[PDB]
């Protein structure tokens, strides 16, 4: 869809995610390449097919998010299934057809509520026509001279204007309605009233299946975790299960859905893992093949964790300095404020287990707990949270070990 | 239905899958054969029944490949189903005749798509008329002259012309329609409506029933994996279990689609393994019986290889330069550069686990994963790929063995 | 229904298997019983049950062949399910009632397929009349001489015997039809269209009810897998709760089917085993009672071998002349030629595992493997197939054991 | 609904069972008191339940028997269970609540069938007055003289008495009909249609549910292999919770069937075991208390399978005699030829394992299939089965042990 080079794309993923930049390419490489598919012949269209990713890397560094910006900047179906949610089915368990089913239901969920957005002026436009005909009946047969019913627009413009706001004056109109009913009502009574009859069936639904087929990615998530490993082998079984059951999906196959046929041979596929216990090559032969793209992701430094936390669009940061102006405080992060904010998320990864960015958001929140309290009680004032502010509240909570186990 | 002789059939078949001759001979005469019987009498057409196969070979040497490209040969449905799953069933799994359902819904999904083709000329022939006719309303009672229709054929003519590009200009056409939707709409909404009355839904959905009885293709994967091992017992029972609930399938048997009622009897199985752990005599002795061919594939050389990469049609080097030419680069690889790409390819196999052809297109991706993203910053250029850029970009990776595992 | 004597059952089964004298006429007394039991009084008719079988023998002896044709000989619903098949409903899988299902899904499946038969000519007889009425649309009131109507009948008769071929001139006809369209067709749009009139509903499947009850024959095979065996106790409760479930079905009782209540009390039942590990004996009382008749097969001769090759109807060998000779070619077996084919069956069967007759079937397929792929090249050829040609191509393999235990 | 008193129940008992007095008389007072109840009071009414009882005796001694005669003695609703079955649902199970779901399937096929018969006769007899109707279309407004109609009965019963025989003459009738089908069918679809009509829907299916209510007759077989036992736990739990299970069932409570709501409370429970592992004080307390009738069986002697082979009605001997007089031949047994039958029938029931009366038909097969299968080439003749016969058949058998255990 999109018609942007991988370049441009790298660059739309440098607003949401910091560093990794490698796996940021080999996404792009992705996502373009639907696009070269499309500009080729018949033959070569089906021949062609999507170049899997396989990302390598520790817990919570990006992989994820920059799976979901990457589907979000091409507006395209995205579902995200842990891998391990199928290895109990030996017993019992959700098929891994679901995948292709609920990134149908949400392939869905998405045209739906991205049709009233089209339709969300049609309503408050050719439809608001409604209330405005019952406010002035027009003539016994209008007559004919394309302005002649734009002539009000005087009494018509008149009552259309002072609906700018003014309503709860009952009336009536019109399965089409005839119900008496009042305005806060019959005005959004038509809302939907007018909106149902924009949109039909049989290609709203119809076109799920089409983006799906066209651009839905898939993102399994600790594929590693259904490798086989030197412990046992009952359990291996089990796992290499899920493999086998997966390789429809990623070599082209049909699935079905209380929508229609789903063909999978163009679905996208980011398979994820850490790759500590199990390496890619513990991958059953046929998925290492349809796995061809593998780029590893970098742990994150203490220099990208000042960077996460005020360099992306609507970073935590950003976001709470929103949020407290809902309550009309001005909130403000010096440079040595965020710096200490990092180094502490830094120690309770290291001193405890790491998490990666996820710790920034819960030290982050802890910092802040009584900011969020009394913001309204702080209205109209200019805090500040510097260096000495974040040491106060992180200092003795990060210091102690069990304790960051539990609070942070 | 194909009229193609063995010796036709493998040639077509050579356009796709270097070597393996003898499975190319073999997976032929069964084709053959369904013609051959089609020819015979009335009782000597029930007796006459599928010479199923049983390939056996190393992993990704073109088991898969010869089944897809042969039943694609004969326009046949075709469904893989990994033998493997049916093993948990004992627990709960997907019933065995699940494989005759899924050969049933992609009958459909196929039946259905080839059915959008007749239905995409006519569709929007008998389409336009419906445009044409609110652009120049038809006189009241058409003069039966079989040329007084093909008059504007004049004025009409010059709408049609006039329609061969410029469009997306408001109309208002007929449940019907009768709503005022643009010409681009009319015209796209047309093309629904004037190709569903152009179907016959019952007749459709009869027709895949047909295909699966009379064409349809089964291959069995990992069916060596169900056989019996001096490993263990209880799996012993639960993978000879799935021996014989496969059984009736390949016997003749009926199973419930939700399209209707299905007939396995003529359907054509390709079981494939490796047959390193059991043997073909380890099968039980009624699908033994059921199998009365049997082939073996030998292993890829790094000559297949070097073939395998530019020779078959729309070959993955093939497809490269047509996915570059996209971005109007102009790629080259020379015979030393793609001699070198095999040997790499052959290397990482001898070298770490041996994924059977299946490693080129590891190999050839991270290979072109700089050109792939620099492509449209290299416009208009001609790049070539030979030996010193092959082997600048994949020793080291292929040297290092433990990135291999993870990269290649 | 069928009024045949025993003698004359065997006689018929005789044409089809070679040997096993007594499991035919145990099978014949069976089917005879089922008239003698009609030819009852009220009392006597509820009372006498079918008297069950267990057929004891060896692998591919003729068990199931013998079933089968005594199925097919009585017009019968048959089915064949293998008894292990519900060992695992312990922790699930399909229950018993299943088989009383599928004995119902295939006695329609043959119901309607039969009824195609007696309507496929009513289409082609009180229904081409569609066609001809539009090629020579009837008089204004046809008159009354019960011959004028027979009159054109060179006018017609014209029409009629044109169309011995002669057709793809689109006209139109008629939710009846109307729409215009071809011959190849409107003609065939009529093949069904008129022959969904004369079959009706409640009496087409309300008689699968009646088939299933009054001549319905299950096969269960390997009985003798679910007896008790001196290794353990868990599976033996496993075991034994099989026959506990199979017990309703052949004591007597009510299965529920999407197509109605059918009662099991008079449907034949032939059950099979090996016995090598239980016997008859271990089988439950309340089972035994069931399975009154007990007949033993002998295991097959290197002679029952040559016969088995040559004088069934549409044996393998007369199968194979006859799809050569779709190819043109003229096959033909010399009496020595067989008596080797026969001899090297016997051979793997002996030096490797024992699959009985089965074992001929692959080895006269690979016999012919070469003949069968070339035959399009060979048209209008007699080609012998005697004891040279026979050793040729057989002795390598045979000889070799290893290599008998993929390829023979 | 029967009106018998108990002596009479035994009495008509007596007809189908050999000894076994006892459980003759408890299986008699228990159909006795559902009369005594109906003939209480209101309150009284819901307190006296059914008195279930527990049958004790070994395998094939008439358990089963004398509670099938009981039910088919009073037109009760029937279902036997075997309570092992859901040991099972521990794991996945069918649920206890199916025996009286199935209990209402087969009261259903009951009330259903025992329709069509009160609806065979008028539903023929106002069916032929259609025929008739198209012989002889009556006068244009019958002249009320309630015998003018019955005037042909001189032209009428003129058809009336030709159509006795007489038919397979095509003529046309009346969703009615219109179309114009042979007598011989036209008189077969109108048993239909006027049956049918005839057939009062809702009421049928509510019939079934008054019956499974009030004289419901459940058969719980080898309850005892439901109670604990002392060789292990975990099964005992299990054992133990089929007991808690069915305990609703026989204590009073509701199950939902597809065919509505039904009340155990009245239904009659028959539990029976061998108790040879367990005792019957093993049952669960709740449960020995809703089984307040103990009765014990003795087993079978010789001379009780003498008068079993002869004196029931339909007796097996009986029917034998019937059965080849089908084929015209005239079979006798002397006194000392049944002397001799049971005795061998007792022979290999001490040598072997003993399967109770059951051992009598097996034994009286194979001493019979020599004549049944020469049966219609012994047309005129009197055979005659004497000590002589019977020996020269059964001896060499019966003498060899092993043999016994897998022919008889
Ligand atoms: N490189 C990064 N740039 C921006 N945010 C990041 C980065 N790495 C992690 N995060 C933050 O941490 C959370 C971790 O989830 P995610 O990024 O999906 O990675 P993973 O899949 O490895 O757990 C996300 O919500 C994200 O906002
Ligand atoms: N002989 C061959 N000719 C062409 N391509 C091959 C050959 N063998 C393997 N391949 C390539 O490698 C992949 C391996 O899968 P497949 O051919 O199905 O074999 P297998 O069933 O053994 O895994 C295929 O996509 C195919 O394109
Ligand atoms: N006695 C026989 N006469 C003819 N064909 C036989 C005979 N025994 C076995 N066969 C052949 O071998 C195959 C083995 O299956 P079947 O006859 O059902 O026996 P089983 O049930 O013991 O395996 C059949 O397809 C049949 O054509
Ligand atoms: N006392 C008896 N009188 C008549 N027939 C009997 C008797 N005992 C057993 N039988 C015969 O043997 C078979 C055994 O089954 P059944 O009578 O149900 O007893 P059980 O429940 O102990 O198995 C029945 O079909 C029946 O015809």
């Given at each position: 869809h999109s018609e942007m080079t991988p370049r441009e794309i790298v660059s739309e993923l440098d607003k949401h995610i910091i560093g990794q930049d490698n796996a940021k390419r080999s996404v792009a490489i992705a996502l373009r390449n639907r696009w070269r598919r499309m500009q080729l012949n018949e033959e070569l269209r089906h021949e062609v097919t999507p170049k899997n990713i396989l990302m390598i890397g520790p817990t919570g560094v990006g992989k994820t998010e920059i799976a979901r910006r990457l589907a979000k900047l091409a507006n395209a179906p995205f579902?995200?299934?842990?891998?391990?949610?199928?290895?109990?089915?030996?017993?019992?368990?959700?098929?891994?057809?679901?995948?292709?089913?609920?990134?149908?239901?949400?392939?869905?969920?998405?045209?739906?509520?991205?049709?009233?957005?089209?339709?969300?002026y049609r309503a408050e436009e050719l439809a608001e026509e409604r209330i405005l005909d019952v406010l002035i009946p027009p003539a016994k047969n209008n007559?004919?001279?394309?302005?002649?019913?734009?002539?009000?627009?005087?009494?018509?413009?008149?009552?259309?204007?002072?609906?700018?706001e003014g309503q709860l004056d009952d009336k009536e109109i019109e399965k089409q309605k005839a119900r008496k009913l009042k305005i806060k009502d019959a005005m959004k009574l038509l809302i939907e009233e007018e909106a149902a009859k924009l949109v039909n069936p049989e290609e709203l639904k119809q076109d799920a299946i089409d983006a799906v087929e066209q651009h839905g990615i898939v993102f399994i998530d600790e594929?590693?975790?259904?490798?086989?490993?030197?412990?046992?082998?009952?359990?291996?079984?089990?796992?290499?299960?899920?493999?086998?059951?997966?390789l429809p999906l990623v070599e082209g196959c049909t699935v079905s859905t209380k929508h229609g046929m789903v063909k999978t041979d163009h679905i996208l596929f980011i398979a994820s893992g850490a790759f500590q216990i199990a390496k890619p090559s513990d991958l059953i032969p046929e998925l290492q093949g349809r796995l061809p793209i593998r780029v590893e992701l970098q742990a994150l430094t203490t220099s990208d964790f000042e960077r996460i936390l005020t360099e992306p669009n609507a970073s935590i940061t950003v976001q709470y300095k929103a949020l407290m102006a809902t309550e009309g405080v001005?909130?403000?992060?010096?440079?040595?404020?965020?710096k200490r904010i990092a180094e502490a998320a830094?120690?309770?990864?290291?001193?405890?287990?790491?998490?990666?960015?996820?710790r920034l958001h819960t030290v982050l929140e802890r910092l802040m707990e009584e900011i969020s309290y009394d913001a309204s009680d702080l209205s109209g004032q200019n805090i500040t949270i510097d260096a000495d502010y974040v040491s106060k509240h992180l200092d003795a909570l990060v210091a102690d070990e069990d304790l960051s186990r539990f609070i942070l």
């Open positions: 579902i995200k299934v842990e891998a391990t949610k199928f290895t109990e089915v030996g017993y019992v368990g959700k098929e891994v057809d679901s995948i292709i089913r609920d990134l149908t239901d949400a392939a869905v969920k998405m045209v739906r509520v991205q049709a009233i957005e089209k339709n969300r007559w004919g001279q394309t302005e002649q019913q734009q002539e009000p627009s005087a009494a018509r413009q008149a009552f259309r204007k002072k609906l700018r594929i590693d975790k259904i490798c086989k490993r030197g412990e046992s082998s009952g359990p291996d079984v089990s796992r290499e299960g899920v493999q086998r059951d997966l001005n909130i403000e992060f010096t440079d040595s404020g965020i830094w120690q309770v990864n290291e001193s405890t287990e790491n998490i990666g960015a996820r």
